[PDB]
Structures are given as structure tokens and as C-alpha cells.
Enzyme design. Structure first.
Site: not given
Ligand code: T9W
Ligand code: NAG
Length: 338
Positions: A145, A243, A287
């Protein structure tokens, strides 16, 4: 169990100034090392980070961390649960910097929080050298993630670190799980939140990517299909075609308009992986996968994820490394997580 060690360099801290750390179990016959980056979104200003501190404190502080963690999935040491690297040295790096592993800014008299994710990775590598990493043949930097995006942002820097410390024989590779996102139009924005965070964090991105997009545009390097072509280390990409975190930032939660949106998203993700030789991309709505106990269950075109990673090892007949589903709807693959 992996055992907790707080960093001996106490200037490398979680958000609230408490020391960062890592959970370790060694395999003393092995020259493989697996360093896993935890995920868990991020925060991008004072008020947004204050809210995270009230309800997600373990992602901002080490003061309440337990002394052990159970290794699961690819961090498991049991061959039946982990056919790929059950005998490797296992490291779990907790995510306590809320910066997608990109920050290099200390808590000071004008900064309420420290954002040190990039320095945490490099300090963990330094301190592991004296616990047997100095004799390693392979270092696999993995993550899920936000941790999967952090692999893309940091794998080349880890290889540079070891090359300049005198260890040119350690092969550094990356494994990015569920961190390959698209800057697409929403169904009803993540791009400043990232642009605003980079400023708040003093975030850093890989060089060759930074030199392409230049000042003010380094937020582009947080998107896999833009930063991956610039990387020099081998990187294996695991990515659900649908996702859950992607649909969240797309404001998706079935009539024709939504059907066309979901099908177009799957097609675009497939297109960005066309020239990624080592990849695993099932047509599922889910996920994360690599540290979950049943991660050996999913298959693409008859090949499981642990098999595909083994085939990747051999590549570095009948043992493929590029596995991307072509059916266009969530769960058209019967092995999707239930
Ligand atoms: O569950 C999790 O850790 C999800 O975390 C996230 C962290 C960053 C991003 N993200 C990028 O890196 C670029 C655009 C954007 O939205 C998305 C989810
Ligand atoms: C501790 O970490 C900081 C931040 O990376 C670094 O500047 C400093 O040199 C480190 N101290 C030692 C003794 O390595």
C-alpha cells in the site's frame, strides 16, 4: 515472532519524536534479507496530522509498540505458508512517519512533527549491517500500500547507500505491493494532497525521476507508471486491477456509467503494466496481499504469487514472471480473495 529493536541513533524518530525501529528475526544460515515497509495512508498538514494522532497513534509513535510481531505471509518462516523465502532473514519496519516513506525533516522549533521515512529506511539498513547484513547476497525491499509506493521511492537509494559503504556484492531488489496508483479522473484531489505533503514533509524522490519533472513537479514520482521507468534496481510489481484504495481516491463506492468507469480503470492499469516484465496483477477488488496468511491462494493464468516470485529469482520454460489478467470485471478470476 520478530523481535523489536529501537534505533540506536535516537535522532531518527517517528512523527512525535519517539525513536523509530524495526522487528527482526535472523536466519543464521541464510544470505537473503527481506525488509518490509508497512502501509497506512499519510497526513499532509497540522490539523490532518492532529486527527491521525488521536486515533491512529501507533502509526505516529513507538511509545505503545509491542515487543514482538508474528511473521505472516512472505514474512512467515514456515515453508507451507511461505514457499518463496521461508528461510530468509525477516525484517518488519513499522510505518510511523505518515509521509509515504519520503520525508527527511526533523521535529524542531518550527515543525510540530518529524517526517523521516526516507532516513528511517537508511538508518535501519546501517544498523543491520552489524547484525549480519554485511554478508548478504540479496536484499529484497518489499512493502504494501503506502509501503509499496515507498519501495518505488527508496529502492535505488538503498542500492546507492550500500555501494558507497563498500558492499557492491549485495544485490538490492524491490517488491511493490498495492502501491501502483493512477492520477485519473474521479468518478465524482490526491494530487495536491501529495503536492502539499511533499512540502510539509520535505519529501524526497529518486534522482533520475526528480531531474525529469524538476522543481514543483516531484509529486509525479509518487505514481508508479511515471517513476518505474527511471529506476535501475529490479522491481517486481504486484497490483490488483481494481485496488480498493484506488477506488477510494476515485470516489467510487451498477448502472452503465459506473460500469464503464470500472472497466476503463481496469484497462488503463493493464496498459501501464504492459512493459513491466516482472508483475502479478489479478482482476480482483481487494487491498494488499504479500503479508497475509492466505497469499498463496491467488493465481493468474494458473501460476501463484509465490511461484512467480521464485521464477523472478531464476530469471535474475513454464515458469512465468509477467502475469496480468485480461478479463475486465472484479472477480472474473475465481481465485480472488473472498
Ligand atoms: O492503504 C494505504 O496505505 C494507501 O495509502 C496511500 C498512500 C498514497 C497514495 N497515493 C500516492 O502515492 C500517489 C496518489 C495517491 O493517492 C494512495 C494510498
Ligand atoms: C543519526 O541520524 C542522522 C539523520 O540521518 C544523521 O545525520 C547522523 O549522522 C546519525 N548519527 C550517526 C552517529 O550516525
Amino acid at each position: 515472532d520478530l523481535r523489536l529493536h529501537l534505533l540506536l541513533n535516537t535522532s531518527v524518530t517517528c512523527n512525535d519524536g519517539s525513536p523509530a525501529g524495526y522487528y527482526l528475526k535472523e536466519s543464521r544460515g541464510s544470505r537473503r534479507w527481506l525488509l518490509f515497509l508497512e502501509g497506512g495512508w499519510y497526513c499532509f498538514n497540522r490539523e490532518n496530522c492532529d486527527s491521525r494522532y488521536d486515533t491512529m497513534r501507533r502509526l505516529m509513535s513507538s511509545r505503545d509498540w509491542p515487543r514482538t510481531r508474528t511473521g505472516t505471509g512472505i514474512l512467515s518462516s514456515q515453508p507451507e505458508e511461505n514457499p518463496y523465502w521461508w528461510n530468509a532473514n525477516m525484517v518488519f519496519i513499522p510505518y510511523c512517519s505518515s509521509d509515504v516513506w519520503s520525508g527527511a525533516s526533523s521535529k524542531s522549533e518550527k515543525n510540530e512533527y518529524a517526517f523521516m521515512g526516507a532516513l528511517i529506511i537508511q538508518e535501519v539498513v546501517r544498523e543491520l549491517l552489524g547484525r549480519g547484513l554485511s554478508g548478504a547476497k540479496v536484499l529484497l525491499l518489499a512493502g504494501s500500500s503506502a509501503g509499496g509506493t515507498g519501495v518505488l521511492l527508496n529502492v535505488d537509494r538503498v542500492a546507492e547507500q550500500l555501494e558507497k559503504l563498500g558492499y557492491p556484492a549485495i544485490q538490492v531488489r524491490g517488491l511493490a505491493d498495492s502501491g501502483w496508483f493512477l492520477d485519473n479522473k474521479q468518478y465524482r484531489a490526491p494530487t495536491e494532497a501529495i503536492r502539499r505533503g511533499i512540502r510539509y514533509w520535505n519529501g524526497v524522490v529518486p534522482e533520475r525521476c526528480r531531474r525529469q519533472f524538476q522543481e514543483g513537479e516531484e509529486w509525479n514520482c509518487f505514481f508508479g507508471y511515471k517513476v518505474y521507468p527511471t529506476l535501475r534496481s529490479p522491481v517486481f510489481v504486484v497490483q490488483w486491477l481494481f485496488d480498493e484504495a484506488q477506488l477510494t481516491v476515485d470516489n467510487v463506492h451498477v448502472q452503465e456509467g459506473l460500469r464503464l468507469y470500472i472497466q476503463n480503470l481496469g484497462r488503463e492499469l493493464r496498459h501501464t503494466l504492459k512493459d513491466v516484465p516482472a508483475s502479478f496483477a489479478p482482476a480482483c477488488l481487494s487491498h494488499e496481499i504479500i503479508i497475509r496468511s492466505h497469499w498463496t491462494d491467488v493465481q493468474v493464468k494458473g501460476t501463484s504469487l509465490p511461484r512467480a516470485l521464485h521464477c523472478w529469482d531464476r530469471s535474475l520454460k513454464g515458469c512465468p514472471v509477467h502475469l496480468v489478467d485480461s478479463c475486465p470485471w472484479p472477480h472474473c478470476n475465481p481465485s480472488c480473495p473472498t
